[PDB]
Amino acid sequence: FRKISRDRGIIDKIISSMAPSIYGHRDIKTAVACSLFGGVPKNVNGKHSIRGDINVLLLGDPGTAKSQILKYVEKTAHRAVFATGQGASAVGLTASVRKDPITKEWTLEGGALVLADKGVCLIDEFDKMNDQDRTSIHEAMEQQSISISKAGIVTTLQARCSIIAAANPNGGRYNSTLPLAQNVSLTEPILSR
Amino acid sequence: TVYPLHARSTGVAARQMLTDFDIRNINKLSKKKDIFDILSQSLAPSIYGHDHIKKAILLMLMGGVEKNLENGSHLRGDINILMVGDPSTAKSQLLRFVLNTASLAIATTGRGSSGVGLTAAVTTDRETGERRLEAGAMVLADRGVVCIDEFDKMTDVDRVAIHEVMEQQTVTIAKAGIHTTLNARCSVIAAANPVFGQYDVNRDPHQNIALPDSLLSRFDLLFVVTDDINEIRDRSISEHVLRTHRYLPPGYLEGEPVRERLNLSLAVGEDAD
Amino acid sequence: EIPELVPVGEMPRNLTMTCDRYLTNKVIPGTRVTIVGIYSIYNSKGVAIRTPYIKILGIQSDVETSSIWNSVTMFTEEEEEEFLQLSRNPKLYEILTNSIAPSIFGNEDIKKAIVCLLMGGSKKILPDGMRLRGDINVLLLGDPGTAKSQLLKFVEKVSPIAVYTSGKGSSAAGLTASVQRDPMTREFYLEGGAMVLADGGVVCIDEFDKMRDEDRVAIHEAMEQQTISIAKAGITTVLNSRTSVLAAANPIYGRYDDLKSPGDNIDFQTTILSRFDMIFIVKDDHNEERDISIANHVINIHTGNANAMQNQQEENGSEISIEKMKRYITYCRLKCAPRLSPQAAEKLSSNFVTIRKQLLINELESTERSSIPITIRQLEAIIRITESLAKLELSPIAQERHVDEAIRLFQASTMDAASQDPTSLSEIRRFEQELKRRLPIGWSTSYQTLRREFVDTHRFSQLALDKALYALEKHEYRSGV
Amino acid sequence: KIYPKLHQMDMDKVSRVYADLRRESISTGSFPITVRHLESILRIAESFAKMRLSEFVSSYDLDRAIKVVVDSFVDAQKVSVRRQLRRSFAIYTLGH
Amino acid sequence: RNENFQNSSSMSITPIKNLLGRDAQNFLLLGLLNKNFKGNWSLEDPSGSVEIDISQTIPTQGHYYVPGCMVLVEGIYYSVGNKFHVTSMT
Numbered sequence A: 001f002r003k004i005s006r007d008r009g010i011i012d013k014i015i016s017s018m019a020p021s022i023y024g025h026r027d028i029k030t031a032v033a034c035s036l037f038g039g040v041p042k043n044v045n046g047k048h049s050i051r052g053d054i055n056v057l058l059l060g061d062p063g064t065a066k067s068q069i070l071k072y073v074e075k076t077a078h079r080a081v082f083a084t085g086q087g088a089s090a091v092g093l094t095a096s097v098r099k100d101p102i103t104k105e106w107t108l109e110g111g112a113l114v115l116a117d118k119g120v121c122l123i124d125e126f127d128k129m130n131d132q133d134r135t136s137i138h139e140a141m142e143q144q145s146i147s148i149s150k151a152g153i154v155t156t157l158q159a160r161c162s163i164i165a166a167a168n169p170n171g172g173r174y175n176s177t178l179p180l181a182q183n184v185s186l187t188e189p190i191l192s193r
Numbered sequence B: 001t002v003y004p005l006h007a008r009s010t011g012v013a014a015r016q017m018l019t020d021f022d023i024r025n026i027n028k029l030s031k032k033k034d035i036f037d038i039l040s041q042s043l044a045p046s047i048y049g050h051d052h053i054k055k056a057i058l059l060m061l062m063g064g065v066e067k068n069l070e071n072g073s074h075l076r077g078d079i080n081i082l083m084v085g086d087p088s089t090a091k092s093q094l095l096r097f098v099l100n101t102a103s104l105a106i107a108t109t110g111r112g113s114s115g116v117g118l119t120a121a122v123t124t125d126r127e128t129g130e131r132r133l134e135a136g137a138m139v140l141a142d143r144g145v146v147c148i149d150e151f152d153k154m155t156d157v158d159r160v161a162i163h164e165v166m167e168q169q170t171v172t173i174a175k176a177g178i179h180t181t182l183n184a185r186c187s188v189i190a191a192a193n194p195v196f197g198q199y200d201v202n203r204d205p206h207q208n209i210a211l212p213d214s215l216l217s218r219f220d221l222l223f224v225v226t227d228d229i230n231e232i233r234d235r236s237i238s239e240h241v242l243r244t245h246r247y248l249p250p251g252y253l254e255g256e257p258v259r260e261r262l263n264l265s266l267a268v269g270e271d272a273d
Numbered sequence C: 001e002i003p004e005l006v007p008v009g010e011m012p013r014n015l016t017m018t019c020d021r022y023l024t025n026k027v028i029p030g031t032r033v034t035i036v037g038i039y040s041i042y043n044s045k046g047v048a049i050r051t052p053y054i055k056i057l058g059i060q061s062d063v064e065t066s067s068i069w070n071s072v073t074m075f076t077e078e079e080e081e082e083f084l085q086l087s088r089n090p091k092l093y094e095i096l097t098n099s100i101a102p103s104i105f106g107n108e109d110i111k112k113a114i115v116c117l118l119m120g121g122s123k124k125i126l127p128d129g130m131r132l133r134g135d136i137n138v139l140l141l142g143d144p145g146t147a148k149s150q151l152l153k154f155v156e157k158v159s160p161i162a163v164y165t166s167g168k169g170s171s172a173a174g175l176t177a178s179v180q181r182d183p184m185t186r187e188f189y190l191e192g193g194a195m196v197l198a199d200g201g202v203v204c205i206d207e208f209d210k211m212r213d214e215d216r217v218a219i220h221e222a223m224e225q226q227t228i229s230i231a232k233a234g235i236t237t238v239l240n241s242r243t244s245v246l247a248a249a250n251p252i253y254g255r256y257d258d259l260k261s262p263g264d265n266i267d268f269q270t271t272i273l274s275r276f277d278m279i280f281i282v283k284d285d286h287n288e289e290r291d292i293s294i295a296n297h298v299i300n301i302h303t304g305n306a307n308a309m310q311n312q313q314e315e316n317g318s319e320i321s322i323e324k325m326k327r328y329i330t331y332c333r334l335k336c337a338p339r340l341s342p343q344a345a346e347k348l349s350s351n352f353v354t355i356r357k358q359l360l361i362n363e364l365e366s367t368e369r370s371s372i373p374i375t376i377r378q379l380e381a382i383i384r385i386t387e388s389l390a391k392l393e394l395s396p397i398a399q400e401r402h403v404d405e406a407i408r409l410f411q412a413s414t415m416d417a418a419s420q421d422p423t424s425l426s427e428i429r430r431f432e433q434e435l436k437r438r439l440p441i442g443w444s445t446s447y448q449t450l451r452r453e454f455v456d457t458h459r460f461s462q463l464a465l466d467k468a469l470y471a472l473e474k475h476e477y478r479s480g481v
Numbered sequence D: 001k002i003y004p005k006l007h008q009m010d011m012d013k014v015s016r017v018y019a020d021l022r023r024e025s026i027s028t029g030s031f032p033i034t035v036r037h038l039e040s041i042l043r044i045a046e047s048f049a050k051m052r053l054s055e056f057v058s059s060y061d062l063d064r065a066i067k068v069v070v071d072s073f074v075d076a077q078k079v080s081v082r083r084q085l086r087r088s089f090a091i092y093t094l095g096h
Numbered sequence E: 001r002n003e004n005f006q007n008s009s010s011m012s013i014t015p016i017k018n019l020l021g022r023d024a025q026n027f028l029l030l031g032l033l034n035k036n037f038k039g040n041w042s043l044e045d046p047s048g049s050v051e052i053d054i055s056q057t058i059p060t061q062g063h064y065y066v067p068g069c070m071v072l073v074e075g076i077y078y079s080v081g082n083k084f085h086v087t088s089m090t
């Protein structure tokens, strides 16, 4: 890796390296590869912090390998998770508590975003999934940690995960003349974050 | 031995003492016509204005006679007043003043309590082992002045429940396995905000408040509080607040932190009396 | 198990302990402790396996925070003496202002308001059954991505007397205090919610707008009463709520949308705004030069080599050991309570009715009532002055009215940015445009036309011409050269 | 093992970048540009430098990060303004 | 000082802001006289400014009076009329 690092053109080779089975998409390859590498986490005064993880927003026409792009992404960054988007919810992905009849108390249920933490987070079908769940994801990603206080469980879990949302344009086709926000059926704050 | 003292700020267990000196007192003023207005002024001394409102709450405080008839029909002497007011119209404090003034003083807000819980909870208790009656406010309500705030926000099931049970002043509690009927006669004050932030005269009052006339007619008084503002009255309110604020609490050092201590009341039992 | 250890994918294991009479009740839950006790085993009532626990021989605080402050001065007379010296020096007020929110690049009056809120408004108990409400809850409205949530988190880190939370993260039912069924008692017991914890603490919570509104209604009453009255489930418990809530709502469509109707802008009901008594705006700064300077600041704090120099520069003069800032804040809120209006009385006797009159002015500009949102603002403002003088404490010492005047001005214009119209500034912009559509071509010039029409505009002057110039002024030798 | 550091950086390059970012969100096809976008650019630079695998960030690798982010922004715009914006940013694009 | 000399002191000036709070009440004032952009004569102090009704106003014959001068005056304010109906101007 050091020997290739001093070799020049390594960056372009890596761009070609990410998802080779998807011909074209040079910019997309660049984005997803650099997300895999991810930024450097930054912290100020101990408490103030800057995320080291990258949240890729992707808008893709149906059948554009988006799920397969995610599948190539996973198994490449070791620690990985997959978010079906519609399948998960606010509770399911971010932080879940499960009443445990065998132990007789409320117990933590594995939040899939906690599973995302420490590794890359795959997100798919997100443009079609529930909006309250979307706001929950916003909250969770803002601090890189999920804070939950319910059912007597007031725990907060760090969520350090580079996420990549998969989305389809309004009608599946983006209109370049159309503004992006009009091409997007989702909220403005999410594209900002 | 046990000394029950449930009066607020460690009073007289909501049992006002009596002396013939105090008995002969007040009475000579009661002959004077102005005594009613003096009592009205005494109420909510921290609030400015609302003299007619203070008279209404005074009339609230005094309890009417429960006329009885040789049948299931028993006339109610309870006093029920509904009031609608803008936010921060002191009516919340007013309700609080009625609370700290009343003996029983069952008060909460529309979101404050569960309607079924306050009325009656028919769940079982494990130590008892069988189905239990648990009236959060209702059984506490009867035989005492009670209050409710933000009744517009109150759960509609509770609203329809309170409907006609405050008219008949009795609840059948026939829900679930327990069917014993328990009386709920009490005086209630309602303080719900308008649907709009402030009452708009252009909007109907029932447009301004969505609470149906059902049992809304069954309020012995109806009140509308509008925070309209006039230079003279605004100055009046401001000066009142100025007096209330710079005023150091009774005694204490001027530069002394608030204590609100336990009062270290040695007097207990007949000593407390 | 060691929240810092973060065993990846492992649920945090917990062990039971025992404490002796001179060890018990030393520390509270939710607080980390470095323990020294013998490893202990006993049978719970699975072969030859017994309950693992610890019998403690010594207790030390991993959080290292001192116990519930019983006014015993661990800072002693010395540290509080320099604390008062900082209070004695008025410049230290701006020191605390600047120190708060590192790398924010400005917003200094905002930081002043934050410091005043955290400082704690004095709760006065009247001899009457009444009692002056001390704490206030500040409302945070503005454009996203503007460090608002970041600032909230920083402030909560500064003052741990309360706990930072989020709307969705907090259970909708019983936000103040949830009711839960105990495993060994079928009765739904009262579990302490956030504002139970926030009681006695200045609390910051996120995503106010994103939160469901209905239970947020139950919050304004609790903060208003400074208690939490519950009669649900046949349980009539009432718990105190002495807290200073910091809002987090990006008003509508994310951005503040100041150039839009406040009802559209503020999704929250204006009654809630009045009951929470505070108003605040984050708008689009623009100022490409200031944007450049902000970028410089952000990269400086972002690059460790530069980050270090800003860190030490803030520390030596202003950031002065944020922890002992919190210690001083505790000591000086103990210094709040003694007195908060010695110097106020004389000047306040004029300025209070003064601000009342400016509120009357505001309703004068807001004829047609400007809909519901603007009507209750005067009442929340008159209560706001009373609570906000205590909020400002008299400053670190004895500087109440002279700055409260500026702060009330700031709030007045804050609301005016949303209370100028029911499209807000857009409607008065249209008014000044339909004015200027005659000014150059007709309408003479140089105030002569104003001396001519409507008989020296006298009828037009008192209301209509004032509305005209209020719209004109924004579009129409001390600072530049 | 690799943790590239921004020890060297181009302050004013990023300054002019965010300046151009301004007065573009005025376009109907343009989403607002905020501080967190700038932090995004910074973390993209960090990701590029990690991709370069050097323990020290490279200024020109950071430049390619700027290029990628600005190109993404331009693609986000409406095509009508997108051409004007691409001409405007062309003063930045050639440096990559 | 001069009002202390007149009477421990004579009538006291009333803050312009404290004026409008009451309509029919009489007050003593001290402020700078200037033309209001409404067109009336305005008496202005650090607390504020009030347009002055030049009618029913007697000048002190011992002193000149020009705009841009301070003055001690007595009169009603008429908050509804918002113009201080000064009676005597000194």
Ligand SMILES: Nc1ncnc2c1ncn2[C@@H]1O[C@H](COP(=O)(O)OP(=O)(O)OP(O)(O)=S)[C@@H](O)[C@H]1O
Residues within 6 Å of the ligand: A142, A189, A193, C103, C104, C105, C143, C144, C145, C146, C147, C148, C149, C150, C151, C250, C294, C298, D035, D036, D039
């Ligand atoms: N004026 C500023 N000075 C410094 N950093 C800023 C400034 N404005 C925004 N930021 C940065 O932008 C980030 C975005 O803010 P967040 O902490 O995510 O919360 P927020 O500003 O409330 O955003 P929303 O409204 O919740 S999407 C902050 O954490 C800061 O790092």
Ligand SMILES: Nc1ncnc2c1ncn2[C@@H]1O[C@H](COP(=O)(O)OP(=O)(O)O)[C@@H](O)[C@H]1O
Residues within 6 Å of the ligand: A021, A022, A023, A024, A025, A060, A061, A062, A063, A064, A065, A066, A067, A068, A069
């Ligand atoms: N450039 C490409 N090269 C190779 N396969 C591609 C390319 N673009 C799309 N595909 C194919 O498109 C299919 C659909 O991918 P998927 O992400 O499931 O589609 P959708 O767009 O409906 O989410 C995949 O099987 C993938 O192989």
Ligand SMILES: Nc1ncnc2c1ncn2[C@@H]1O[C@H](COP(=O)(O)OP(=O)(O)O)[C@@H](O)[C@H]1O
Residues within 6 Å of the ligand: B046, B047, B048, B049, B085, B086, B087, B088, B089, B090, B091, B092, B093, B094, B191, B237, B240, C224, C383
């Ligand atoms: N006329 C008044 N005099 C004194 N204080 C008042 C008056 N009207 C309102 N207030 C103040 O308004 C604040 C909020 O009153 P509150 O009881 O919450 O209002 P509401 O009537 O809307 O329930 C309190 O501090 C109260 O003292």
Ligand SMILES: [Mg+2]
Residues within 6 Å of the ligand: A065, A066, A067, A068, A124
């Ligand atoms: Mg797919």
Ligand SMILES: [Mg+2]
Residues within 6 Å of the ligand: B087, B088, B091, B092, B149
């Ligand atoms: Mg109220």
Ligand SMILES: [Mg+2]
Residues within 6 Å of the ligand: A142, C148, C149, C206, C207, C248
């Ligand atoms: Mg936020």
